[PDB]
Amino acid sequence: VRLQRICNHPGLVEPRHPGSSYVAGPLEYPSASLILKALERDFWKEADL
Amino acid sequence: DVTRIERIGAHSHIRGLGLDDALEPRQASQGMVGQLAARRAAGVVLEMIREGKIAGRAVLIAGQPGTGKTAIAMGMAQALGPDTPFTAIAGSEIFSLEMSKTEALTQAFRRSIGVRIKEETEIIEGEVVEIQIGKLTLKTTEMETIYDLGTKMIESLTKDKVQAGDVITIDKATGKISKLGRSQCPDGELQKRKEVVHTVSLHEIDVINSRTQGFLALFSGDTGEIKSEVREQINAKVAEWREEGKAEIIPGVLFIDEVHMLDIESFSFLNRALESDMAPVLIMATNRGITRIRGTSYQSPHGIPIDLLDRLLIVSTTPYSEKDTKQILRIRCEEEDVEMSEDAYTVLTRIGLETSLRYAIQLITAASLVCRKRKGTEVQVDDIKRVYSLFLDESRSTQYMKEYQDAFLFNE
Amino acid sequence: DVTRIERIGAHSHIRGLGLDDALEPRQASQGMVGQLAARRAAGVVLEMIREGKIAGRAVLIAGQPGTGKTAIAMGMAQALGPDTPFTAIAGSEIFSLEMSKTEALTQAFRRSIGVRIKEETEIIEGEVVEIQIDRPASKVGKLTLKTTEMETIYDLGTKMIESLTKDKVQAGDVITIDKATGKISKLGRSFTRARDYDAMGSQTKFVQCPDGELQKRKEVVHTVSLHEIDVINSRTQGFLALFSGDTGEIKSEVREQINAKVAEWREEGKAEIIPGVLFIDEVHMLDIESFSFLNRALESDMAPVLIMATNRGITRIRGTSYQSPHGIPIDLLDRLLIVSTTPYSEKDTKQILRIRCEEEDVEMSEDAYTVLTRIGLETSLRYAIQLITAASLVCRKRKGTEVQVDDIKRVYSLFLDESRSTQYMKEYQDAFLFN
Amino acid sequence: TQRIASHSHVKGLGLDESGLAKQAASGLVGQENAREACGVIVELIKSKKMAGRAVLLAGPPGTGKTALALAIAQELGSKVPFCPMVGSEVYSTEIKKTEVLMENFRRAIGLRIKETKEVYEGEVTELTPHVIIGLKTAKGTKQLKLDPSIFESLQKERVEAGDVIYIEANSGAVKRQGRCDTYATEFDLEAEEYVPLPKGDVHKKKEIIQDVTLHDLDVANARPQGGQDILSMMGQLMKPKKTEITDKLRGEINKVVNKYIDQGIAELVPGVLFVDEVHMLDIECFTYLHRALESSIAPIVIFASNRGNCVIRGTEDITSPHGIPLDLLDRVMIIRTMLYTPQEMKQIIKIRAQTEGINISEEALNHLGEIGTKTTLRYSVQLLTPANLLAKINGKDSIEKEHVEEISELFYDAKSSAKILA
Amino acid sequence: SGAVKRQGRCDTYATEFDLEAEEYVPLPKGDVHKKKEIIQDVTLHDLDVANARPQGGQDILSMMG
Amino acid sequence: LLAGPPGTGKTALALAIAQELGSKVPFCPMVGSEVYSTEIKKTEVLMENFRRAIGLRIKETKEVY
Ligand SMILES: Nc1ncnc2c1ncn2[C@@H]1O[C@H](COP(=O)(O)OP(=O)(O)O)[C@@H](O)[C@H]1O
Numbered sequence A: 001v002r003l004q005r006i007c008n009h010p011g012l013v014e015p016r017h018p019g020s021s022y023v024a025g026p027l028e029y030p031s032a033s034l035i036l037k038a039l040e041r042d043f044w045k046e047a048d049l
Numbered sequence B: 001d002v003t004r005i006e007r008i009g010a011h012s013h014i015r016g017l018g019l020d021d022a023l024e025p026r027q028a029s030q031g032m033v034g035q036l037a038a039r040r041a042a043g044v045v046l047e048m049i050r051e052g053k054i055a056g057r058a059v060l061i062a063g064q065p066g067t068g069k070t071a072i073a074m075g076m077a078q079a080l081g082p083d084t085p086f087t088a089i090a091g092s093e094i095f096s097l098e099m100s101k102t103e104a105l106t107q108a109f110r111r112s113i114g115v116r117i118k119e120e121t122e123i124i125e126g127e128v129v130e131i132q133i134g135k136l137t138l139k140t141t142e143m144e145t146i147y148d149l150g151t152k153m154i155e156s157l158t159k160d161k162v163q164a165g166d167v168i169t170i171d172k173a174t175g176k177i178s179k180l181g182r183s184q185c186p187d188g189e190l191q192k193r194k195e196v197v198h199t200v201s202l203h204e205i206d207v208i209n210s211r212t213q214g215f216l217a218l219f220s221g222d223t224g225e226i227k228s229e230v231r232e233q234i235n236a237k238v239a240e241w242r243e244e245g246k247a248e249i250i251p252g253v254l255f256i257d258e259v260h261m262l263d264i265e266s267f268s269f270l271n272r273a274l275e276s277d278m279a280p281v282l283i284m285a286t287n288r289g290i291t292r293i294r295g296t297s298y299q300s301p302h303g304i305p306i307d308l309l310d311r312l313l314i315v316s317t318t319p320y321s322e323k324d325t326k327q328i329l330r331i332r333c334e335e336e337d338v339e340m341s342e343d344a345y346t347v348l349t350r351i352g353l354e355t356s357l358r359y360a361i362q363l364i365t366a367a368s369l370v371c372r373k374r375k376g377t378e379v380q381v382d383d384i385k386r387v388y389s390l391f392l393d394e395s396r397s398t399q400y401m402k403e404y405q406d407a408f409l410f411n412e
Numbered sequence C: 001d002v003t004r005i006e007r008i009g010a011h012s013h014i015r016g017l018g019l020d021d022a023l024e025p026r027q028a029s030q031g032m033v034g035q036l037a038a039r040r041a042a043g044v045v046l047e048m049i050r051e052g053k054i055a056g057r058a059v060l061i062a063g064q065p066g067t068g069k070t071a072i073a074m075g076m077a078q079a080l081g082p083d084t085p086f087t088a089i090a091g092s093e094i095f096s097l098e099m100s101k102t103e104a105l106t107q108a109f110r111r112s113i114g115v116r117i118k119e120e121t122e123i124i125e126g127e128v129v130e131i132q133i134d135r136p137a138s139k140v141g142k143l144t145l146k147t148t149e150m151e152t153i154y155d156l157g158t159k160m161i162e163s164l165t166k167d168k169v170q171a172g173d174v175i176t177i178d179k180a181t182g183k184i185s186k187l188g189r190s191f192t193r194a195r196d197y198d199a200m201g202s203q204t205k206f207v208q209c210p211d212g213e214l215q216k217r218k219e220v221v222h223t224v225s226l227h228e229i230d231v232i233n234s235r236t237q238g239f240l241a242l243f244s245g246d247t248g249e250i251k252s253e254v255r256e257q258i259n260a261k262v263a264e265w266r267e268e269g270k271a272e273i274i275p276g277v278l279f280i281d282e283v284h285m286l287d288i289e290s291f292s293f294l295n296r297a298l299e300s301d302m303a304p305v306l307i308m309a310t311n312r313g314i315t316r317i318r319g320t321s322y323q324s325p326h327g328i329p330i331d332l333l334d335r336l337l338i339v340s341t342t343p344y345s346e347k348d349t350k351q352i353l354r355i356r357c358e359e360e361d362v363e364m365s366e367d368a369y370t371v372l373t374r375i376g377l378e379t380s381l382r383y384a385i386q387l388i389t390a391a392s393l394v395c396r397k398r399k400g401t402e403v404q405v406d407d408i409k410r411v412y413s414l415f416l417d418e419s420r421s422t423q424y425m426k427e428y429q430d431a432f433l434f435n
Numbered sequence D: 001t002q003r004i005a006s007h008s009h010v011k012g013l014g015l016d017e018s019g020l021a022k023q024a025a026s027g028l029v030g031q032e033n034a035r036e037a038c039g040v041i042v043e044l045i046k047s048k049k050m051a052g053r054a055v056l057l058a059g060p061p062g063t064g065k066t067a068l069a070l071a072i073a074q075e076l077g078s079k080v081p082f083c084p085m086v087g088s089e090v091y092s093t094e095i096k097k098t099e100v101l102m103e104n105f106r107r108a109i110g111l112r113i114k115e116t117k118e119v120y121e122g123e124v125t126e127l128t129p130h131v132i133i134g135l136k137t138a139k140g141t142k143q144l145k146l147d148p149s150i151f152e153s154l155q156k157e158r159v160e161a162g163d164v165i166y167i168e169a170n171s172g173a174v175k176r177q178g179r180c181d182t183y184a185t186e187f188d189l190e191a192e193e194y195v196p197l198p199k200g201d202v203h204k205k206k207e208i209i210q211d212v213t214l215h216d217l218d219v220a221n222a223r224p225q226g227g228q229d230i231l232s233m234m235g236q237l238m239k240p241k242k243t244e245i246t247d248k249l250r251g252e253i254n255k256v257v258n259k260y261i262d263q264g265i266a267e268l269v270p271g272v273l274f275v276d277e278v279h280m281l282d283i284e285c286f287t288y289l290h291r292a293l294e295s296s297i298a299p300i301v302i303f304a305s306n307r308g309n310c311v312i313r314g315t316e317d318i319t320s321p322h323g324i325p326l327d328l329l330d331r332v333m334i335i336r337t338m339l340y341t342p343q344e345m346k347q348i349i350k351i352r353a354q355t356e357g358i359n360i361s362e363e364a365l366n367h368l369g370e371i372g373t374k375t376t377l378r379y380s381v382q383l384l385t386p387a388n389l390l391a392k393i394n395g396k397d398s399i400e401k402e403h404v405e406e407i408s409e410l411f412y413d414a415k416s417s418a419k420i421l422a
Numbered sequence E: 001s002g003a004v005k006r007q008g009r010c011d012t013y014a015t016e017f018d019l020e021a022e023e024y025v026p027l028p029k030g031d032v033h034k035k036k037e038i039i040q041d042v043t044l045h046d047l048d049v050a051n052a053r054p055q056g057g058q059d060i061l062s063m064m065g
Numbered sequence F: 001l002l003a004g005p006p007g008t009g010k011t012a013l014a015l016a017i018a019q020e021l022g023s024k025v026p027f028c029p030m031v032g033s034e035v036y037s038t039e040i041k042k043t044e045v046l047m048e049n050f051r052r053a054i055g056l057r058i059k060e061t062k063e064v065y
């Protein structure tokens, strides 16, 4: 029966799977809140440049 | 737990400097052997780093090839706490096609100084009981509570489908909800206050604030010549954080292995870079004697100009004796799980003294493989002789290249 | 008659290698004169190329300047035909600001390997005899096609209706429909539009009615080089870089993926490899890094047949201080066969001048042929060739029919060769810069 | 038949069970000592214990260095990564030399990750605007709620009800592959391609094993192509270019891979980096290789060199035994390849003839061997296919001595050409 | 300049809900209208780089920039 | 031009000048090797550093409601 399967069509025993990429999760990168507050100057120290 | 990413390298056996509380170096401790004076000096430098009060201190490790300079540096990295940054680069790595040499050295310096920021946040973690849209009911194994939902929190719970029976955690200040499964239910308090401590290098701050989504440049590279104004503004903001107490500065180490590959421009930059108050402790290694400085015709005691050599303290590494070489071979064998007979140890020590230490270290693995092939259990002299026959050292290879000089290309 | 893009060039007389069935060169065939040993070797190399079984075979054509190395290369190209790719580059072309020298050599190698794809398509081909499209203001439609053998009425889907409307299919159009994708192509019209319609100012010729069945199983052959595949797969908008040349260093992983799938396509029936020729003229302009890459590159199974030419003797390899034969390292010279070209004689030079006169369409007297052959032997072959054209122009200026000796003497006096110009430069050396 | 390359005959090292080289086995001839040393090196690579161990194949040209390296690659198999490279390839115009070296080091470390792929497939029934779409298969019909990103992907595919779609929820990729064969008879002619209904379940989970290098993860995270968001999409428009990947990114990838190995959903397969023309590197590359080879992550690296005592590229007057500075020669094991005797040359020529499908007589073989005693082995081999072409043209099915002589008269060797020039 | 910045919700409404993802900021202490004479030091290079490339533009080309 | 043997206080003297001037007066330090930018020509780096050393104190009354 197995040989008859193969004689009919190889996809009966070993089908061609669709090749696909691996997908990784994003590299989560922790940082402090202050890091984003850098370069933020008080509005009482910024002139109308 | 098989075939981890970290495998047995050249400096895997080194776990520290092997020093006492008086910085007296033990003859064999934490993988280190001999180099007593240089290990004591490395320990003094390590204490300097840990104190972190003085900025811009430079130390050069100098000696013959194989005298354990990179080993000393790796030991200092291992002994130094993982919290404190330790940037280790080769001297050829500053020749980037994406940034100038001075910019690469600047980034390396700023990668070696860390800003430690502590902040508290409130985290809610529990099991969902009932959700009405708004009202939210959460329970733990010890307590249950019902919360009145806001418009933004209702939107957050609507975007991420949350239903009864799910176990989720919510950041109270931001509403960040992540589902971790369905129901073990959390045991303790539903609402907890957690301090979190991040150490962010000055370079990470610079790049994060360089541009929109600038943190991507911390991973892929792509960081151009960061503007000097941004760096100055960040230096001032970091000083303000230190004054206000919002952050602490953790000075680290920049290690430039084989610094002799730097050019006169890089050395001139290093002359002034070590004079800033945010300069880290610089450690260098070089085997060059009096030799020409790259980019100039001038010869210098280490390929480093005497301007920079005047800004640094030099640590010399001696040759090893027979006992130290044998002990290093023993520690490498223990690291690689190789059992050798005493006569094999003597033969390998003789080979290491005669030809090279690295050659003996490589012959350790070669002899182990040859012994495994013959169904052996302990490496014998026959295996050391076999691997000595199969594999040549630089001296013997050179002698054979001289024997057949007519067959080689551009031989002189 | 009309001035085409291609004009009479320096090798326009070369039509091939001029060999018989036994690869024994003829004295004067297909524009080739002399070089019997070199042409026989070129024929053997061309057979080796056409067999395609051996990869990375390198042949260097070495000889004195003006002995026919580029001529032999062009003859090989002509006898190879357009089916087999033949990429000819100057050695100085690899020095690029867009990519490394090794990337340039890879793209040159991959450009010299064709991939001949085959696919079967369902093609409808017939004369539109009636088309009806009804739309609200979904669309419905009915199309009838004829092919002398049959006339079939089709009920049209929405997508086919949209395609037919976009193509503006009208009755009397001989169209082709690709059932695999619905692309509609018009071969031509079969008869005029109604004469009663104003504008429509055309009376184009009408193609003959199709024959046989309306729908046929047609096999189509598409050939692309490996470089085209690489550039297409390098990025989302890769195909635009095939023309602009804005190709950065294509990732080696993509090239390995392509090599693997091409191997599968040749294990399957989908594609056939056509390995061709990369001709690096003046290869001595390559530096040591390029030769060192060529050493490993020829060991690849996808490497083409590399042909090289250079006139340098034992000279300094570029980028180094070492002298080697041909300006090529001994490590690459070991990996190649050298073919040597010999200087021509009086008879060969005269035959070459005759062929050049024939291609330039210059009638010239036998005494003029003798004096020009003497000049060419004395000075150079190319100088005599250029005097052919100059003397033709001078003869036509005087309303003469045949270039005589007076014209050759005139153009010889007008235009100098390297030697007489050098002598006059030395006679006035103080006037030239930096002595 | 596949095209025959210079190293096609090499099928392995031809070592016996006791690791000793047979005189002629697996395409290789002679070089017994060097084959045995490459045997011990293959065993080292298979042991997966040592990182960063380097070996240098040093010998005259044509003495088998590249053949030995490819024999090692064959003995390892297709499972073990093998990255052949040339030293001249490090001179990239896009990234620095050290980045090219590091990327090649990371390419040679493989990783087999078993990943669970969940696929939704079927014929679309409803596309109600989050979207509650429906899929129908040979088994039954299910209603599914998907992220708006999947809906935008469907719109990109222009999916309409009645079309057969393939949705990989892991990567958020949708492939519309046709309209259902049920509709294939509705119109006598339509522009679309019809495909049968899927026979399996609507939602299927399949476990697959993916082979990637660490370099693949590095480049994927450095230049992300999976953001499917406005800023990432705008970034994807930018011209692609190699970038100087930082050590932070490689450390993060190291941590992720360690977590995968701990979970058991991944296996790490250290492979080989082979640098053919190491003397083409400069002193900067060698200085970087010092640190690189000492790393606990580095693969087994194989070097080839045919230079004598020559000048190191990038220095002024520093000469070294193979063009490699003495500091790097101390870190490598050296394997010496010896010149071939005429009998070994005759055996190699016979093997090359048998690989190329060429029949050669004993007298012709002896003449070709004599030609190889002068000139070089490569030249004597390279005369086989021209001579077989001339044999076929002359109506003979075997190379005779006359054809060898004629080909040697048509084609000159390097020494003969040098003599002519001199 | 007429620029308006919403610096959070007033802390008097911190009890309007038990769980909202909002930033509460205290009510300002001084008067509604505040005057302050200020000084800022800039370099000419700062003006050069500010005018080197448009910033803050809502146009798509400015957003890409 | 501050001239003399290494370690004779040339940089110390320049920093003493900077201290005597004060924070308001700009003081741009640079090293000769910093002109070799890979993005802009050396003369551009020098012009940028020239412009950095010129300050401009801008005085304004902010009015905010
Ligand atoms: N004092 C020591 N104790 C233990 N191992 C050592 C010592 N010195 C050197 N080694 C080992 O010997 C080898 C060569 O030393 P290394 O530090 O690489 O020399 P170099 O200064 O030339 O870099 C390395 O494997 C190193 O770990």
Ligand SMILES: Nc1ncnc2c1ncn2[C@@H]1O[C@H](COP(=O)(O)OP(=O)(O)O)[C@@H](O)[C@H]1O
Residues within 6 Å of the ligand: C010, C011, C014, C031, C032, C033, C034, C035, C063, C064, C065, C066, C067, C068, C069, C070, C071, C072, C352, C355, C381, C382, C385
């Ligand atoms: N055997 C030949 N038959 C016909 N034309 C030739 C032959 N040899 C040289 N020529 C012609 O003479 C000129 C010589 O230039 P070329 O063949 O490029 O010489 P090389 O490449 O050796 O410098 C060209 O116009 C070439 O077409």
Ligand SMILES: Nc1ncnc2c1ncn2[C@@H]1O[C@H](COP(=O)(O)OP(=O)(O)O)[C@@H](O)[C@H]1O
Residues within 6 Å of the ligand: D006, D007, D008, D010, D027, D028, D029, D030, D031, D060, D061, D062, D063, D064, D065, D066, D067, D068, D304, D306, D348, D351, D377, D378
């Ligand atoms: N021991 C050997 N047995 C069989 N074939 C060999 C042997 N050594 C080299 N060859 C073949 O001869 C040619 C010479 O290449 P190779 O010697 O590997 O170049 P190199 O070693 O100089 O890089 C190649 O076709 C190679 O496959």
Ligand SMILES: Nc1ncnc2c1ncn2[C@@H]1O[C@H](COP(=O)(O)OP(=O)(O)O)[C@@H](O)[C@H]1O
Residues within 6 Å of the ligand: F004, F005, F006, F007, F008, F009, F010, F011, F012, F013
């Ligand atoms: N005149 C001085 N008074 C006090 N300390 C000085 C003086 N000159 C130099 N120093 C100290 O010695 C160090 C070396 O002087 P430095 O200014 O670096 O000389 P140069 O810049 O000429 O190399 C300075 O960093 C400072 O710590």
Ligand SMILES: [Mg+2]
Residues within 6 Å of the ligand: B069, B070, B071, B257, B285
């Ligand atoms: Mg070292």
Ligand SMILES: [Mg+2]
Residues within 6 Å of the ligand: C069, C070, C071
């Ligand atoms: Mg030419």
Ligand SMILES: [Mg+2]
Residues within 6 Å of the ligand: C295, D065, D066, D276, D304
């Ligand atoms: Mg090689």
Ligand SMILES: [Mg+2]
Residues within 6 Å of the ligand: F010, F011, F012
């Ligand atoms: Mg100073």
